[PDB]
């Protein structure tokens, strides 16, 4: 003669959602590998990175000689047009972060010294890159030095 429970809640999860949240999430967490970053969200987060960069530099101690830059697309595009172009991006939050030297190139060139080759090998570029970065991991004042 006795009757059991019905429970309205679970009916919300079945009907309003095509997935079932009262299922053990640890099965997918431990076995199935995750999913990467998608579209229509990276543009906002990069523009969030655009804003925190343009406010980092108005705070951090800027060398005002010649370093024209555009912070567009998440990279400050640190460049003096004679010798230097690099893309530096904060790895984390605004205030206390070091930097990274995401791209490196040199604007100095000659057309007849080398044999039609880039006079510099990329191994020095990396050799500079970590030398910047180990001293960026030495956490000095970033802009003046």
């Amino acid at each position: 003669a006795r009757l059991p429970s019905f429970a309205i809640p679970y009916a919300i999860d079945v009907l309003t959602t095509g997935s079932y949240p009262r299922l053990p999430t640890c099965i997918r967490d431990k076995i199935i590998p995750p999913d990467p970053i998608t579209k229509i969200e990276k543009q906002a987060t990069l523009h969030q990175l655009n804003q925190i960069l343009r406010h980092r530099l108005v705070t951090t101690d800027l060398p005002p000689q010649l370093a024209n830059l555009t912070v567009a697309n998440g990279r400050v595009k640190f460049r003096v047009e004679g010798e230097f172009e690099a893309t530096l991006t904060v790895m984390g939050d605004d205030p206390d972060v070091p930097w990274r030297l995401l791209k490196l190139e040199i604007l100095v060139e000659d057309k007849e010294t080398g044999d039609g080759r880039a006079l510099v090998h990329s191994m020095q570029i990396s050799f500079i890159h970590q030398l910047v970065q180990s001293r960026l991991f030495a956490d000095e004042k970033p802009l003046q030095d």
């Binding site: 010294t113 080398g114 044999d115 080759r117 006079l119 030398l131 180990s134």
Partner: peptide, 25 residues
């Protein structure tokens, strides 16, 4: 189922740079 065959003087004066700017930790 290479070299420009001028790397020798490039590296030589780069060697002069290593005894003036050494790598720094």
């Amino acid at each position: 189922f290479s070299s420009i065959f001028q790397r020798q003087r490039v590296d030589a004066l780069l060697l002069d740079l290593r005894q003036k700017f050494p790598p720094k930790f």
